[PDB]
Design a protein around this ligand. Structure first.
Ligand SMILES: [Ca+2]
Ligand SMILES: [Ca+2]
Ligand SMILES: [Ca+2]
Ligand SMILES: [Ca+2]
Ligand SMILES: [Zn+2]
Length: 316
């Protein structure tokens, strides 16, 4: 849209009030021209035809309940964009400021969100399992991080490479949540998942076995469902990332935590410099070990804790 940049206000999925960057041109559009080539939010109007229509609003105030998912998809996209820019110096997912597009109100009772190869897609949920998925900052950041993975390492979506793929997304989803300081934790999707049940979440990085996922490589799922257990075997890596950052003792292996900033740097470097499309866990450990070495030195505590956390989850 060709118009004037402006700022609007509205309410997100959880009822919180926020400003959003909009563009005026007869109507007020969810078009943020302050970040790269733009952040554009579309309304799928309960269908599956994508992208739907660029969101247009008459007075630049977004307080209706129908608007809530849009507000949040637009804002958290802006937050994820800024995380990657300011913390890793990466401009959009392609590293060239490609425009970021999202569609909300996709389909009816749709209990998921995904990156489809060109844009973000968010369901509204059924009201029991999910509320509108763009309400979870980590959900948003997890899915946009898949777009960064596609442009960089190219992890294919199955088996161990697909599990690494999902873990990277949970890792960077979590670190965006800490960066925004938006009630942070190590769990995935607790702000939108099962609104009638307090304290639960889809997955846990700090204790994956709490929701059924493996937390050691000997426990790994070796079946064929879920593309080879891409959302299940990610707990092995999540657990490891959690030990690197927070530290802990896990199957008798003690790890000294080095913090989230270092975890992010070590994993951003492995992702963009040593991982390939078909990398497996073992290769991820090597990549991670090499990245810490590159950044902090071969005999640093940083290397010591990468190795100890892969050893605690059984990845050699
Ligand atoms: Ca309005
Ligand atoms: Ca949280
Ligand atoms: Ca979370
Ligand atoms: Ca819940
Ligand atoms: Zn994912």
């Amino acid at each position: 849209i060709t118009g004037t940049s402006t700022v609007g206000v509205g309410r997100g999925v959880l009822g919180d009030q926020k400003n959003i960057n909009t563009t005026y041109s007869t109507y007020y559009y969810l078009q943020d021209n302050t970040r790269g080539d733009g952040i554009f939010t579309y309304d799928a109007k309960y269908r599956t035809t994508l992208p739907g229509s660029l969101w247009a609003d008459a007075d630049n105030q977004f307080f209706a309940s129908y608007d809530a998912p849009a507000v949040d998809a637009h804002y958290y996209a802006g937050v994820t964009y800024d995380y990657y820019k300011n913390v890793h110096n990466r401009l959009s997912y392609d590293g060239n400021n490609a425009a970021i597009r999202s569609s909300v109100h996709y389909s009816q009772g749709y209990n998921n969100a995904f990156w489809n190869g060109s844009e973000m897609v968010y369901g509204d949920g059924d009201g029991q399992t999910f509320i509108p998925l763009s309400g979870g900052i980590d959900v948003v950041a997890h899915e946009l991080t898949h777009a960064v993975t596609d442009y960089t390492a190219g992890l294919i979506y199955q088996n161990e490479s697909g599990a690494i793929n999902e873990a990277i997304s949970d890792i960077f989803g979590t670190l965006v949540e800490f960066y925004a300081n938006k009630n942070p934790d190590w769990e995935i999707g607790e702000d939108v998942y099962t609104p009638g049940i307090s304290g639960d979440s889809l997955r846990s990085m700090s204790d994956p076995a709490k929701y059924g996922d493996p937390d050691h490589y000997s426990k790994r799922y070796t079946g064929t469902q879920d593309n080879g257990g891409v959302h299940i075997n990610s707990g092995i890596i999540n657990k490891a990332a959690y030990l690197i950052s927070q530290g802990g003792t896990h199957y008798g292996v003690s790890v000294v935590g080095i913090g989230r900033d270092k975890l992010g740097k070590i994993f951003y470097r492995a992702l963009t410099q040593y991982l390939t499309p078909t990398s497996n866990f073992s290769q991820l450990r090597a990549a991670a070990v090499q990245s810490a070495t590159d950044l902090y030195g071969s005999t640093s505590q940083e290397v010591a804790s990468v190795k100890q956390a892969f050893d605690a989850v059984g990845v050699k």
